[PDB]
Amino acid sequence: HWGYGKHNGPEHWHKDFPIAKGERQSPVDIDTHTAKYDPSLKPLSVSYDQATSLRILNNGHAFNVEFDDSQDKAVLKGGPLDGTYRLIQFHFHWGSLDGQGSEHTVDKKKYAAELHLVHWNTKYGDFGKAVQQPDGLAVLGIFLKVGSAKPGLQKVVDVLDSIKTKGKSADFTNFDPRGLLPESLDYWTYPGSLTTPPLLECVTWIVLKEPISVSSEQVLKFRKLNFNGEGEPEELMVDNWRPAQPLKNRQIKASF
Ligand SMILES: [O][B]1([O])O[C]C2=[C][C]=C([N]C(=O)[N]C3=[C][C]=[C][C]=[C]3)[C]=C21
Ligand SMILES: [Zn+2]
């Protein structure tokens, strides 16, 4: 099936998922000079104090840390959003080199990686229903640059050995996602989609202006993961990001 290889990468996705060439595809380049400042843009409200992480899984294209979304334990609201969005999981996209890895770009600049904290609109009852709605998801995008180590990420980095291959999972309780947030919550926002098949156009993207920094050693661990399952030919999990897509008839709004 789909992947990030030469014969099934982003350039092929359109054959099984024609929406790949839709009107609001993600990711996109963020032209800082073209993005319009919106004063009516409310401040983001991130309430992760009651977050309940369950576990971590290698699904073959990334690793997800899942949370209990059966109650409003960790929600996202405010900003361009109307309603409450529960955190269901987070994952990253990264490269083989520090000069690449992020999905969104800032004035064409690529970051070493990109974190996605996924939230679904509770008014839709479950994530499955939400992804079928234009305003079903709220994804918080945070860029990662190589530099100083991020203490709040080390717990994730140390468990990766337990989920090296596709299909593996491990208990990952008591993880506090607030440790992955930059100091500032300034952001850019625009209507887009999932960056991996089925590429549903159900996402309100909120990309933070300020990046978080991680050490070269921390990102190196990410690069030692495997796309393949155990017992199969080793395929290093790297460059699991989709290239910038045409903005088309969309305008990116800034909160600053
Ligand atoms: O854009 B992201 O990388 O970041 C946030 C996010 C969330 C979910 C997916 N993926 C799905 O929701 N997949 C799916 C599978 C089967 C049926 C319906 C949906 C992809 C992304
Ligand atoms: Zn993602």
Author numbering: 4 to 125, 127 to 260
Quote the original article:
Carbonic anhydrases (CAs) are metalloenzymes that catalyse the reversible hydration of carbon dioxide to bicarbonate and proton. All human (h) CAs belong to the α-class, with 12 catalytically active isoforms so far identified. Here, we report a structural analysis of benzoxaboroles containing urea/thiourea groups, showing that these molecules are very versatile since they can bind the enzyme assuming different binding conformations and coordination geometries of the catalytic zinc ion.
Electron density maps were well defined for the whole inhibitor molecule in the case of hCA II/thiourea adducts, whereas a greater conformational variability was observed for the phenyl substituent of urea derivatives. Indeed, even if compounds 2a and 2b differ from 3a and 3b only for one atom (an oxygen atom instead of a sulphur one), their arrangement in the enzyme active site is completely different. One of the main differences is related to the geometry of the urea/thiourea moiety, which is trans-trans in the case of 2a and 2b and trans-cis in 3a and 3b. Based on the inhibition data reported in Table 1, showing that ureido-benzoxaboroles have greater affinity for hCA II with respect to thiourea derivatives, it can be supposed that the binding conformation observed for compounds 2a and 2b is energetically more favoured with respect to that adopted by compounds 3a and 3b.
